[PDB]
DNA sequence: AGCGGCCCTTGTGTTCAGGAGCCAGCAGGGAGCTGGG
RNA sequence: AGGGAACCCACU
DNA sequence: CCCAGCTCCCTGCTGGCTCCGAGTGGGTTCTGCCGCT
């Protein structure tokens, strides 16, 4: 995804326009559930990766199981999926959020 | 627009040249160089309207320039004088493609050699 | 005037090789990655003197799908290409059982010659290129996105998937620089992949008209 | 109501046109139902050989070379016309600038021929040369520069003022005088 | 109003004193409809016959009598756009004409006389529609207006000393734009005072008051020089809509 | 004294004008910054500027510091008269006052020539408004009539009245514009 | 430096698909050493900007010279007799009318031109029928003597001069009137690369800004980047690169116009406008001509413009 | 060399054009509508000053010393008569890009000397 | 009583929103082909 | 049951 | 076996047509008449 992004944005501008404010959603989740950053968390990182995969499968812009619809769906949400994967990392979920 | 006016000039110029040009081009047959010609590629006709005798004269001027350079710097060998002059003439012919430009280049080389001799 | 012409010929040959490779013809890697020194070695270095001669640059390539399909790329010497040279090229193609050819002219081509090219389309598909156009590869410009030619099966799949009619797709002119580069005629559909700041990637289809 | 001042020579430049520089004078008599007669003296933009000065007169639908106009007024010799146009004979730049106009007008060497030429350009040229000359003379007497004079025997004053207009055009073309401003008050009444 | 060019609608430099800079409609007719300044006067016109008679009586040489060789070093003289002759001493001719106009012996106050020094033309205008304004005369860095003139003006109700007496005693002068191009105005008499580095020191006229450049509607604004100019234009537009 | 040499891409007059404009703009900026520094926390100009309710720092500078330079068509006040901006100056005066530099604040008040030059400056903007209105209005109508019938269809494509495909997905991603937000990609800039 | 049209005028130039923009320009990026050092950048600039003979000439003068052996100028006579050593030519085929052209040393050194190149261009444009002779550069003045080899010859030489000054090109491309050269101060024009450490870096490199548009010739030039070199004229982009290239370039120009003031408009609106303008394979101008040529319908068209004409055709 | 003037015929006062005597090969100035000829001396028949290096002092007239709107300086005395005051102005003429140069004219009524520094 | 007929004053006569982009028609130029020598 | 055309001024 | 017209296409200019922001509030003047059929 990093290589794909560097190809898409040849310059060094990382400001993009995307639907969901993932950082603010994580902040809201931290405030709602009283997350203590100073204690170990009970979130299995494999849980994080599996959840991200299922979520990515749940966000469809071009529906259809044929190869054309599959490729169009992958293209439509490519940038948002890259953002989601790089934000909902197992490592970031463990040591940052 | 500009190109149209340009070709306007072109048609005027060509008809004026024809008015100033003879009906038949009186082609003066190229003079074959004498076997004693020290000019490389003396039989070439690459440069139009250039005579072998003109090349011989240019090589003679190069010879005089080299002689002046030698007497100023006291060059030892003499055969080198002739070889260098012939090489210079052949190089000038190879580079230039028009008689007037050829003559100008030869004169420029002569001036360069003269200045070098003056420097010592 | 002598090295400049050799450089121009090398650039034209490199662009033609890239075009042929992009069209699906079998071109070796050395031909694509040929330097100016290699061009001066294989060919001449005094184009005005006649070495190399434009007749010496003629290149024949063969399609990967079937070796029978071959394409010429002729380099006429005359600045303006008339009917007689087109007739000579057509005679050579008929003798050699070739169907496609590319003509890279220097200054241009007569209107009658263009009409002749158009007339015999169903028999001999031969195209026309200005060497000023082939001095660079337009497909490498940052503005030009990735163009691909869709096979009839792929176009049928596309129309079935989107329930479209060919006249409902966006259009690309047959005289478009990229259309000429890929040699796509009317009725063919071209797929265009381009980056997108909103979606990441985007594929759009254009019908050649 | 604002209008542009009359009887004053204005030189404006319009490079998006056929004329590089264009003089202008809205000559109007002291009192007359006839509106102001506008005369132009314009220098052709480069692009034959030199730059030719033409004169656009009222009731003539084709621009005529200035030297033809000066000959129609009764000044045939080049010396007299240049005396009326170029006041300093030791300034060769103006002479070089005016040479093309003299070259343009060489076949027409007499007043009657010039009048016939001017009449031929008229709106309604007559098949008879006499009536064409009559029309041209009438136009020059009454329509060209009314403010200078409308009666007869005013040819010298007309020639002097037209030469002054040509001189102003030449000065503007040579860069010796700034072009007039259309928004400048004082050029307005 | 259809034309969208901004040049005719712009406030030209020459409108100074003649036309109000502020008052103008802000709609489609912005800059095309203007208003006179307070002291601006538009001339009504007069016959050039007395001026031509004086010039002929003067050293001026007719256009017909002269020879073309004499025009190179001579000064062309125009009267209402008619080249009437040439002269040899433009400076003293202009001095005489200015003296006559100030005395009003033969030239009325409305006549505007412009000498183009770089060129060699003297243009005399007696036409109508020439907007002008009155300016004080300065001779040698001193106003011609004195304390006695003000003393007489203070009693105009009794001694019948009006503005026409100022204009007739050569203390004030009507200047139009063409002639205003050739004058050297002092905004205030302070500019005539000696300075460590004199700016001009050759002033020819002085402003009666710089605030006379405004019109009827922009003349009621208090402290209009402390406001942004569009505000002054808007008030000029709104002073006509006030109820009184 | 012919001791000034033109800069690349410019002529001598352009270079001189650039130097003068640079000097005067720097002076205006410095005086404006000094004006900002002088203000107290109780100042109401600063109160309305800091909150963003109304006004800017340029307004404060003009009210307290110099008003600045008045330009007509992007250049200093032109020589409307013969080599003079007004009949109160000498011929060929390129100084700050002559060409329309206002050194007085609005509180101090403008001098007559400054008042006239500022009036010219304001007239420029008034005309600009009066003309831009119609030009932009025609442009807007033309755009609307060009694109009025394009809409999102039930197959999610964007098509015009003729039912021809304009976009296969709206915005190439098929999302409405009112719900997207600015965000930052965290994997683009970082080094390996 | 160079005036660039922006705002509503540029927007009108864009959506109208004007063929004659007020200020067309190119943005030429250089490839190799030309990008780093300014000398080779200046070389390329001179190779681009048009240069007619009138831009380097000091003054021309048409003399009458009966015998070239003895000319009317002492220095010219000396140099000519140095040149005229033999009857290497045909004496009969010579005209006595000389055209002496004095060039400008400053301009020639600025363009790195020489008498040899000018003589070459004169010969190419006029052929061998003329005769041009030039002195050495080390001389005090740059002088060229032109004659016609054998309507009068006088006016003929005058016309030859009046043409040579203007139409003849010594360097550059015809339609490029001026070419500025500068180092960009903003990362939008700087060369962005990804270092060996995988981090973005912005190299500063010389770029050229032309005043005309000859995009094809400029792109084909050596030492000119053909990947990043672009134009602000969209008709030229369409003619040279194509419909997708002009789509992207039109979007770029619209974004520049809109965001020059710092304002933001969502990308999808610009994308939709550009798609509508380029969906049919040609530049559909946002005008009566562009819009009413579509296959929309007479009632659709009549509401826009040309009501009665549209309905009469229908 | 400089710009070439124009000569007028002695019998008709019309412009004389350059021509060549074929047999003698000498430049003549011959009238076109008459049969008059004159001997040319300069031998230069045309001049074009592309640089336009015109000495603008030739375009200045001492009359400008009477202009009240021109600035006057006492630090640039005139060399001819030693007067201390002079009016200074600029080129203000087209065909001069480097037109910030100052030209001085003596204020003395009779001197009228024009110079440049 | 109502139709002829319109006055544009120069029947010959100044600008009836004027200028900017598209489209259409005319004349010129040249490529190529074909009937005579 | 009832109008219109033209022009001018002005407001946002 | 070339020469010189003639046909057919393409170029360039020149001439003509259409368009020129959205609403709103006031006001005044004018929408025939004159000769003799
Ligand atoms: Zn004679
Ligand atoms: Zn003196």
Curated annotation (Swiss-Prot), chain B:
Free-text domain note: The alpha-helix immediately C-terminal to the Zn(2+)-binding site (residues 438-453, characterized in C-terminally truncated contructs) is required for helicase activity, is positively charged, and may play a role in DNA-binding and choice of substrates.
Tissue-wise expression: Ubiquitous.
Region entry Interaction with POLR2A, spans: 1-120
Function of the molecule: DNA helicase that plays an important role in DNA replication, transcription and repair. Probably unwinds DNA in a 3'-5' direction. Binds to the RNA polymerase II subunit POLR2A during transcription elongation and suppresses transcription-associated genomic instability. Also associates with POLR1A and enforces the stability of ribosomal DNA arrays. Plays an important role in mitotic chromosome separation after cross-over events and cell cycle progress.
Name of the protein: ATP-dependent DNA helicase Q5
Effect upon mutating residue 89 to A/D: Abolishes interaction with POLR2A
Organism: Homo sapiens
Effect of substituting residue 102 to A: Reduces interaction with POLR2A
First and last residues shown, out of full length: 496 to 615 of 991
UniProtKB/Swiss-Prot annotation, chain H:
GO biological process: maintenance of transcriptional fidelity during transcription elongation by RNA polymerase II; transcription by RNA polymerase II; transcription initiation at RNA polymerase II promoter; transcription-coupled nucleotide-excision repair
Signal sequence region: none
RNA-binding recorded as keyword: no
Keywords associated with the record: Acetylation, DNA-directed RNA polymerase, Metal-binding, Nucleus, Transcription, Zinc, Zinc-finger
Zinc fingers (C4-type), renumbered ranges: 9-34
InterPro entries, alphabetized: DNA-dir_RNA_pol-M_15_CS, Rpa12/Rpb9/Rpc10/TFS, Zn_ribbon_RPB9, Zn_ribbon_RPB9_C, Znf_TFIIS
Entry binding sites for Zn(2+) 1: 9, 12, 31, 34
Recorded GO MF terms: DNA-directed RNA polymerase activity; nucleic acid binding; zinc ion binding
Zinc fingers (TFIIS-type), renumbered ranges: 74-116
Principal location: nucleus
Location(s) in or outside the cell: Nucleus, Nucleolus
Any single GO CC term annotated in Swiss-Prot or TrEMBL for this entry: nucleus
UniProt KW Acetylation keyword: yes
Binding site for Zn(2+) 2: 78, 81, 106, 111
Family designation: Belongs to the archaeal RpoM/eukaryotic RPA12/RPB9/RPC11 RNA polymerase family.
Subunit and partners: Component of the RNA polymerase II (Pol II) complex consisting of 12 subunits.
Function: DNA-dependent RNA polymerase catalyzes the transcription of DNA into RNA using the four ribonucleoside triphosphates as substrates. Component of RNA polymerase II which synthesizes mRNA precursors and many functional non-coding RNAs. Pol II is the central component of the basal RNA polymerase II transcription machinery. It is composed of mobile elements that move relative to each other. RPB9 is part of the upper jaw surrounding the central large cleft and thought to grab the incoming DNA template.
Protein name, UniProt field: DNA-directed RNA polymerase II subunit RPB9
Originating organism: Sus scrofa (Pig)
Taxonomy of the source species: Eukaryota, Metazoa, Chordata, Craniata, Vertebrata
